[PDB]
Amino acid sequence: MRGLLVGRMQPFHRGHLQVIKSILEEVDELIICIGSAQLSHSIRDPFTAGERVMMLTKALSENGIPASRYYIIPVQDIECNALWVGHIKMLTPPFDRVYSGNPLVQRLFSEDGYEVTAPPLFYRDRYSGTEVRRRMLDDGDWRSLLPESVVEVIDEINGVERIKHLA
Ligand SMILES: NC(=O)c1ccc[n+]([C@@H]2O[C@H](COP(=O)([O-])OP(=O)(O)OC[C@H]3O[C@@H](n4cnc5c(N)ncnc54)[C@H](O)[C@@H]3O)[C@@H](O)[C@H]2O)c1
Ligand code: NA
Numbered sequence: 001m002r003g004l005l006v007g008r009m010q011p012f013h014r015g016h017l018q019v020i021k022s023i024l025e026e027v028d029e030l031i032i033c034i035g036s037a038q039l040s041h042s043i044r045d046p047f048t049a050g051e052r053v054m055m056l057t058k059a060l061s062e063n064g065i066p067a068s069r070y071y072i073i074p075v076q077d078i079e080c081n082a083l084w085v086g087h088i089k090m091l092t093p094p095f096d097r098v099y100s101g102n103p104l105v106q107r108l109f110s111e112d113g114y115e116v117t118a119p120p121l122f123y124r125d126r127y128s129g130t131e132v133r134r135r136m137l138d139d140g141d142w143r144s145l146l147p148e149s150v151v152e153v154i155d156e157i158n159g160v161e162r163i164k165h166l167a
Pocket of ligand 2: 007008009010011128129130
């Protein structure tokens with residue numbers, strides 16, 4: 001029983017972490033696709049896919065979730081939304097259920113015949129990439145929004161300096 005979760009993870013935050021843990025209570029393995037893998041260095045998508053692979057790896061590891069329970073697969077975006085479900089399928093192991101709070105993702109997988117679950121949002125007003133990046137830019141408390149392993153990654157790659165320069 002394998003689930004699928006798609007997210008840009010810009011950057012991976014505590015909301016992503018909560019949702020993943022609960023998904024792991026109902027599936028054996030979780031495929032985690034890092035969407036928009038071709039985008040980096042913009043205010044909306046600051047981090048490369050590879051930096052995001054590291055954030056994920058360190059966070060899940062820090063929280064003791066064994067690697068054999070999930071897959072991390074970067075997925076570039078494509079021009080045709082009508083082909084995107086097939087694009088994900090092509091790049092991943094087979095899966096039984098899809099988890100997403102994104103309307104487009106929900107609708108595409110639904111039209112393709114998949115049951116889609118929209119888990120309850122964990123602290124939706126603070127746990128969002130938008131809020132994290134807004135705090136990094138305006139000097140607010142972004143660190144408390146992310147697992148500490150992710151903050152370490154962001155420090156090592158000079159993420160704040162990057163985003164501020166870009167803005
Ligand atoms: N044609 C295409 O190329 C196409 C079509 C559809 C989607 N996509 C890609 O899908 C990706 C989009 O993922 P996104 O925008 O939803 O990323 P995101 O990182 O903002 O959200 C990831 C998912 O994590 C969960 N989540 C996030 N915050 C949460 C919180 N506080 N509490 C609980 N759960 C929470 C939700 O399931 C959410 O949909 C993008 O890369 C997008 O480009 C591509
Ligand atoms: Na994000």
